[PDB]
């Protein structure tokens, strides 16, 4: 029973052989034998960052009980993908072979968000009744604080040092917690309506939030007062994310169908304003290459953007990446797998493109002709 395996081991062997002997990274040629020369995604930067684009569809997975997936998340080293269910269970899925059925019954209500620590030693998960559970990498209880928020937890993020983490819920209130004991620290009092997302700056102490008040606010993890606010969205801002590696950028998507990128280096300098006909649902920066991110629309239609290539249009559009609106995007921390979840109760995985494959950008994902993942082969490229 030979399944499909996507492991970055042999590419890393090749990369370190080239690196230790001083050999250059040979340019990949459009042929099958040159896939061995496709370096791991962390090896590519600058011009050849286009090789890291998750353009290929490689696996469609769905659990036995087809619940609705409110959030997905990768393990910090990318071994397994943690899929939250409406019933409050952690469904794990191995990254190498995308197969598992490990129900865990994590929460009682619907798990709405999970977040892993930067040191890969802890996980926090919130649910629909404002309960935060702090987990261990082996998925054991470490702390179960009840009613940390009134309504459903929307988003939460760790600090750089992982001793603190901010959370947001359907309320108009953000809170800071000392991660060591879950002590209730200062409350980010402010905002007018239903904060929808929150994020922590990767290096600096800086909190970014999005609410229904048509405002993106920058907060203070120490003073606890709104240090700045962005008034450039004409409707509720669905999500905000800093650039994970450097943090020099900050995205935000609103219900006015506009995505804006702000350069925090020069007084909230706006760099992009892309307006679509379909609603943006969720966003995700690339974990390795900056200036690269993916936007998920209300009709599927995964859109990959590049700040250095185009400031008005996406550099790659997968118009039918999902049957219904895409609700969760997750990048493998290794960067070789992209995981997307939508309201069709399915989980789809995306990998980097191959030098030559017959489907290319023409498949039941790029066009509409049934759907399948061909889970019976021994390769990535499928003939015809």
């Amino acid at each position: 029973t030979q399944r499909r395996s996507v492991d970055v081991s042999s590419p890393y062997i090749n990369l370190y052989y080239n690196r230790r002997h001083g050999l250059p990274n040979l340019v990949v040629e459009p042929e099958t034998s040159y896939t061995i020369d496709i370096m791991p995604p962390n090896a590519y930067r600058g011009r050849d960052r286009v090789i890291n684009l998750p353009s290929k569809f490689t696996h469609l997975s769905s659990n036995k009980v087809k619940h609705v997936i409110p959030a997905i998340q990768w393990t910090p080293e990318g071994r397994r993908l943690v899929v939250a269910t409406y019933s409050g269970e952690f469904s794990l899925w191995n990254a190498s072979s995308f197969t598992f059925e490990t129900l865990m019954q994590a929460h009682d209500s619907a798990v709405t968000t999970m977040k892993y620590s930067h040191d890969s030693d802890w996980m926090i998960s919130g649910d629909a009744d404002g309960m935060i559970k702090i987990w261990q990498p082996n998925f054991s209880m470490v702390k179960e604080i009840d009613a940390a928020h009134t309504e459903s937890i929307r988003d939460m993020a760790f600090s750089s040092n992982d001793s603190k983490f901010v959370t947001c819920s359907d309320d108009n209130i953000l809170k800071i917690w000392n991660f060591s004991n879950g002590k209730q620290e200062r409350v980010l009092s402010g905002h007018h309506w239903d904060v929808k997302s929150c994020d922590w700056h990767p290096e600096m102490g800086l909190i970014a939030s999005a609410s229904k008040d048509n405002l993106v606010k920058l907060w203070d993890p120490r003073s606890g007062n709104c240090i700045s606010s962005i008034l450039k969205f004409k409707h509720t801002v669905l999500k905000t994310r800093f650039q994970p590696t450097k943090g020099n950028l900050l995205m935000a998507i609103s219900k006015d169908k506009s995505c804006r990128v702000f350069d925090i280096r020069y007084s909230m300098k706006e760099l992009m304003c892309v307006r679509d006909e379909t609603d943006y649902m969720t966003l995700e920066w690339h974990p390795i290459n900056e200036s690269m991110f993916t936007l998920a629309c209300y009709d599927g239609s995964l859109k990959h953007f590049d700040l250095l290539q185009n400031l008005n249009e996406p550099i790659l559009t997968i118009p039918y990446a999902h049957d219904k609106c895409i609700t969760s995007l997750s990048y493998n921390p290794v960067g070789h797998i992209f995981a997307t979840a939508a309201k069709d109760r399915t989980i789809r995985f995306w990998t980097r493109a191959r030098p030559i494959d017959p489907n290319a950008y023409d498949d039941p994902t790029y066009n509409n002709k049934k759907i399948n993942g061909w889970f019976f082969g021994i390769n990535n490229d499928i003939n015809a």
């Binding site: 081991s9 001083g22 040629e29 459009p30 290459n289 250095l308 550099i315 390769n379």
Partner: protein, 1237 residues
């Protein structure tokens, strides 16, 4: 608390250019290895003679040329680090390079960069000498130059020049323009091999004329677009400007674009391209590198413009260009008949050496990455041709592995006498990539070849005479019993049975005299003058005992106990006279410690009657008690000269007139020619502390001597203020000069630790340890040989090995070629030494085309059999006996299998009796694509004595102990307390051993991404991760476990790991892909360490090249729990060591280093602190405990005595003493290899 030193200097040539930099008399060649800029004089016959060498504190990334007004010397433009430009000028008055202007574009680049900057910026120079642009990526910094100041303010723009420019691939200045016009190659939409089927022809090209408008306060540039091209192939990466336009060298197409911006013709290379004049070629060549090295040569007088391209496999291609619109655009390959480029791969630079006033009969200097740099002669260029090797700069390629073993010291006795280098181990490293890969032995000392080992002929000191150069009368002496013997060296011996010698007094000196027609013997209190038949003729009674004798043909100089100077001259008429020679009256007043007769032309400008560089004058050189060197000629006329500055050992010396505090540091001086074929006059000074100082006489202005302090090439052998007294106390150190050792003019320094000074033609003189036994007396023997007598009365005749020995690079290098013409093992790696069997084991890594097969037997669909493929792997293990350096046994491995790690390990077979056997364990990983499950295997081998072939040294065989194929690539192998731990895909497994060769796993752990390296210190382990640093693991035995003790808080792509234990504490050394060296320690007591689970970052030290391997080696404690040090090999060919320090030693060396940085002047305006600590990890470790650079501290020894004393006064009272002590200790840290077993 660690210090960084360069055991080996870098030897891969990365940049090269020709100009008039140091002088305008000849066309110089500038060679940049990694941080060393060397100035060479290419001879007529293609040899490279070094004239000046400089070492910079940062990695030199580019070198540029610009000419200054009213001067024939071109100013040097140095580009180091990231986005840096420094103007360098040569000051012939001081014979040193000085800095004219600095330009720091890094901060301004980051201020308008959306993403992280590229590692190295690229410098472009216009062929008009008006401006220079340094572009990193998407951002161009412009440096204009005046046609007052020499460079106006710098202005940088990203895409303000042309709106279209989005993703710049290459920028080049264009030729034949009255204004600075540049050409830009950029891809607004990025396309790779997977994007070729959606977006077609995404590369764009534009030519911009720049209106450089320098101003007093700023600089503005108004750009006018000359032309514009829209559709160009995706794989274009290089722009090669020519007279009529430019050549766009792509991975598969060459596109010619003129100065009007119209594509004329395109030449296809491989079957990997398709669709406007398209010239098709089936020659499957590929420019798969990002940058393709090439040399463009303008026409002579005539119309002959040639462009030579280069291939990663060191192929040269010829591009013809002729025009009336350009016609006949094509590509041709020039053949190599004698495959002299077979061992050379990855060329980096090409430079034309000799003008010749034509484009035929060329002289090319080409730097390479794997093989040695070659000077090539190309006689006739055609579309007969031939090539030849004129010179070579020894390159040890990328050091890919390191281990200690026995190369010398293998035999306990040689030629019936004990081995002169017994109990001595050496560092053996694998070198190069591919066909030229070999073994490089980094010798800790010079191993001398033995030709005669006669016993007990000397007691105290010998003298070998030459009646006609026939080795007669090897006179010996007995300083204890006051006896002297004659002996016959013509296979007679048993003394001469009477030859009218004294024989009853301590002979002080004896040598041939008067054109070998006389023999003069100076005993303790008497002087004699014999003949060839040894009949005594004249006797001069010395009322005072002699303590120094120097002899030239006419004169003999004798120095006595009160210091009286007596110089006698042989009478050329009938001899037997020995007339006295008059001396200046000042000589009576001054006190002299030592003296010698000398022959030099350094006074040929003050002496009356001659001002010619030739005709070196005979001089009487004397060293005073105030460390002053004085000298005078025969017809002195009471004129006494002196070398000014020797007393303070200044960086520069010159001839003057002597002008009238005894601290006799200087013990012996020597002025003689040193070198192999290009002999240069050098002034060598021996101190009573045993240290050796050297000076170089410039061929022009011969009255001046200079020393290089920036170049750390002279090894430290002693200390001034009685520190390291153990090097001179036992055996007196005397420098003996030999103009012909093996064709080399060397200097032998005797003592308990002997030294030899050897200078190669392409390098500065180097001081090498000579053997591993004490040396008492050395005399010339035969022709090109010496006789050496040790402290145990043994006598040995020595010869200098030359076959595969290089005597530069701070340590002798022996090249061991394991692959012959019969079998070529290609690149060698993971070399180990079997201690019990005294054998060396290596792994070959022959490259083969890769076939992408599925999980079943079939291959994947998209394979093309009509197309060239990518490279795979096929490895094995070789058994090599160091006695003959020959392969005894070889074992092969299946396809795609690469040995990622071999380790001769001490495996504990029995848990009860604790028995251990040194098996060999190899970690084999199957190198495949990402679309197949990882698989691998591990093998365990025994080395068992067998009956040799009816050929010696064939008595050992490789016997498999265990063998198993596992799931997941095996990337590392490590033994933990008798059990070997190997790494699978995201797992590490420990397996035990029983007597029945039964292997069973006992514990396991999960690793984040990929295991890059693994080391064990007892039952502790460190496992490096390709993305998230490394982790600390402890292993327990009875219940087997893999407790995770900590992880590095900083995620980086670690390359190699090792332990820097440093006494009671413990530290880890990690190297990243960013050329950084990270020191982390397991600190479980600090409050912020999370009880040890977080490894605290201590220091981040930026290296000048990528680290490939790291080893643990014991430290040699010269004065003072075992100590260890790390030794690492580098891609550029250098070897470095990290020597852990104590607290007091570290404080002393840190204060010395900061005082050197502040007080002293750095070469090219390079701050070592910013060359090393200015990385992405600067705000992570301790600010006041950085990694120390011994190269910076090495400059402490090069200062004047007063300045050296003042420097140590910054911290500590007697800081000079202990500072010299620990500097010596660090210098001799690797001498633990000299005392093995």
């Amino acid at each position: 608390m660690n210090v960084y030193d360069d055991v080996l200097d870098a030897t891969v040539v990365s940049h090269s250019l020709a100009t008039h930099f140091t002088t305008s008399d000849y066309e110089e060649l500038l060679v940049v290895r990694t941080n060393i800029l060397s100035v060479y004089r290419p001879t007529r016959d293609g040899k490279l003679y070094l004239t000046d060498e400089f070492k910079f504190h940062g990695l030199i990334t580019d070198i540029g040329l610009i000419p200054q007004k009213d001067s024939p010397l071109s100013c040097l433009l140095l580009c180091t680090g990231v986005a840096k430009i420094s103007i360098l000028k040569f000051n012939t008055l001081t014979n040193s390079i000085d800095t004219l202007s600095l330009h720091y574009y890094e901060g301004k680049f980051k201020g308008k960069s959306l993403v992280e900057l590229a590692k190295i910026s690229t410098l472009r120079m216009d062929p008009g000498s008006s401006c220079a642009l340094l572009f990193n990526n998407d951002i161009i910094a412009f440096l204009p130059f005046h046609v007052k100041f020499t460079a106006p303010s710098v202005v940088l723009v990203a895409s303000e020049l042309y709106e279209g420019a989005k993703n710049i691939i290459d920028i080049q200045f264009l030729k034949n323009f009255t204004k600075p016009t540049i050409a830009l190659l950029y891809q607004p939409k990025l396309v790779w091999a997977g994007n070729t089927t959606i977006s077609k022809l995404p590369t764009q090209y534009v030519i911009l004329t720049l209106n450089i408008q320098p101003a007093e306060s700023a600089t503005k540039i108004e750009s006018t677009t000359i032309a514009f091209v829209k559709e160009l192939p995706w794989d274009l990466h290089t722009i090669v400007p020519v007279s009529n336009g430019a050549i766009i060298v792509g991975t598969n197409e060459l596109a010619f674009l003129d100065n009007t911006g119209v594509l004329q013709s395109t030449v296809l290379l491989n079957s990997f391209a398709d669709k406007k004049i398209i010239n098709n070629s089936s020659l499957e060549i590929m420019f798969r590198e990002k940058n393709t090295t090439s040399i463009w040569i303008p026409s002579s007088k005539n119309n002959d413009e040639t462009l030579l391209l280069m291939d990663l496999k060191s192929n040269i291609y010829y591009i013809q260009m002729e025009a009336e619109l350009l016609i006949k655009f094509d590509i041709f390959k020039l053949p190599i008949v004698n495959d002299l480029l077979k061992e050379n791969s990855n060329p980096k630079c090409i430079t034309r050496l000799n003008a010749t006033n034509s484009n035929k009969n060329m002289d090319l200097f080409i730097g390479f990455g794997s093989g040695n740099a070659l000077v090539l002669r190309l006689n006739n260029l055609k579309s007969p041709f031939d090539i030849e090797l004129l010179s070579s700069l020894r390159n040890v390629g990328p050091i890919t592995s390191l281990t200690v073993g026995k190369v010398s010291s293998i035999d306990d006795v040689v030629k019936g006498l004990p081995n002169p280098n017994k109990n001595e181990y050496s560092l053996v490293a694998t070198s190069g990539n591919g066909s030229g890969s070999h073994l490089t032995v980094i010798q800790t000392s010079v191993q001398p070849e033995i030709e005669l080992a006669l016993k007990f002929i000397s007691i105290t000191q010998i003298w070998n005479l030459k009646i006609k150069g026939r080795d007669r009368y090897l006179i010996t002496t007995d300083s204890t019993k006051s006896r002297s013997d004659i002996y016959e060296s013509d296979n007679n011996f048993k003394l001469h049975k009477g030859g009218r010698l004294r024989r009853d007094a301590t002979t002080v000196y004896i040598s041939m005299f008067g054109e070998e027609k006389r023999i003069i013997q100076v005993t303790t209190n008497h002087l004699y003058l014999y003949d060839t038949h040894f009949r005594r003729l004249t006797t001069i009674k010395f009322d005072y005992e002699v303590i120094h004798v120097s002899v030239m043909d006419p004169y003999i100089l004798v120095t006595v106990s009160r210091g009286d100077i007596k110089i006698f001259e042989l009478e050329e008429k009938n001899k037997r006279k020995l007339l006295k020679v008059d001396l200046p009256e000042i000589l009576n007043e001054m006190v002299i410690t030592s003296g010698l007769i000398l022959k030099s032309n350094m006074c040929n400008e003050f002496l009356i009657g001659l001002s010619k560089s030739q005709e070196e004058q005979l001089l009487f050189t004397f060293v005073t008690a105030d460390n002053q060197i004085i000298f005078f000629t025969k017809d002195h006329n009471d004129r006494i000269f002196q070398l000014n500055g020797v007393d303070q050992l200044n960086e520069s010396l010159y001839i003057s007139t002597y002008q009238l505090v005894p601290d006799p540091s200087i013990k012996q001086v020597m002025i003689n020619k040193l070198g192999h074929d290009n002999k240069e006059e050098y002034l060598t000074i021996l101190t009573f502390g045993g240290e050796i100082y050297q000076y170089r006489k410039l061929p022009q202005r011969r009255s001046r001597f200079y020393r290089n302090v920036t170049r750390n090439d002279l090894a430290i052998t002693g200390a001034p203020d009685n520190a390291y007294a153990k090097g001179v106390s036992s055996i007196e150190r005397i420098m003996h000069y030999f103009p012909d050792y093996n064709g080399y003019s060397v200097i032998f320094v005797t003592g308990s630790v002997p030294y030899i000074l050897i200078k190669e033609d392409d390098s500065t003189p180097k001081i090498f340890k000579f053997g591993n036994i004490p040396l008492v007396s050395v005399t010339p023997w035969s022709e090109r040989s010496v006789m050496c007598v040790d402290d145990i009365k043994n006598a040995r005749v020595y010869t200098l090995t030359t076959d595969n020995m290089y005597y530069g690079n701070k340590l002798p290098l022996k090249q061991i070629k394991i692959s012959n013409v019969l079998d070529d093992y290609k690149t060698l790696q993971k070399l180990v030494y079997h201690e019990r069997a005294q054998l060396f084991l290596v792994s070959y890594c022959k490259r083969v085309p890769y076939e992408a097969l599925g999980e079943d037997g079939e291959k994947v669909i998209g394979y093309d059999e009509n197309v060239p493929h990518a490279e795979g792997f096929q490895s094995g293990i070789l058994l090599i006996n160091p006695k003959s350096w020959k392969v005894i046994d070889k074992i092969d491995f299946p396809k795609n299998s690469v040995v990622n790690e071999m380790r001769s390990s001490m495996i504990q077979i029995n848990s009860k009796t604790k028995r251990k056997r040194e098996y060999i364990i190899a970690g084999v990983a199957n190198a495949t694509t990402e679309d197949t499950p990882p698989t691998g295997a591990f093998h365990i081998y025994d080395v068992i004595e067998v009956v040799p072939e009816p050929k010696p040294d064939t008595n050992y065989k490789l016997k498999e102990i265990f063998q198993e194929e596992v799931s997941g690539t095996v990337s590392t192998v490590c033994e933990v307390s008798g059990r070997f731990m190997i790494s699978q895909s995201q797992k590490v497994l420990v397996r035990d051993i029983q007597e029945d060769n039964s292997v069973i796993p006992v514990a396991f752990l999960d690793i984040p991404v990929f295991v890059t390296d693994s080391k064990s210190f007892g039952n502790l382990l460190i496992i490096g991760d390709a993305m998230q640093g490394f982790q600390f693991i402890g292993f327990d035995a009875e219940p087997y476990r893999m407790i995770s003790l900590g992880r590095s808080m900083s995620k980086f792509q670690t390359m190699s790991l090792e332990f820097l234990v440093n006494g009671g504490d413990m530290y880890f050394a990690a190297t990243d892909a960013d050329r950084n060296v990270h020191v982390l320690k397991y600190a479980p007591d600090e409050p912020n360490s999370l009880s040890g689970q977080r490894l605290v970052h201590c220091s981040s030290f930026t290296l000048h090249s990528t680290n490939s391997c790291m080893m643990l080696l014991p430290r040699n404690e010269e004065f003072g729990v075992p100590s260890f040090q790390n030794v690492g090999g580098q891609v550029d060919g250098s070897v470095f060591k990290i020597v852990p320090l104590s607290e007091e030693k570290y404080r002393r060396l840190y204060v010395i280093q900061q005082q050197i940085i502040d007080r002293e002047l750095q070469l090219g305006g390079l701050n070592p602190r910013m060359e090393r600590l200015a990385n992405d990890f600067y705000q992570m470790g301790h600010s006041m405990r950085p990694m120390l650079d011994f190269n910076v501290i090495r400059r402490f020894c090069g200062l004047a005595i007063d300045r050296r004393k003042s420097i140590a006064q910054k911290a500590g009272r007697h800081a000079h003493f202990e500072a010299w002590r620990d500097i010596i200790n660090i210098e001799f840290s690797m001498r633990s290899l000299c005392q093995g077993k």
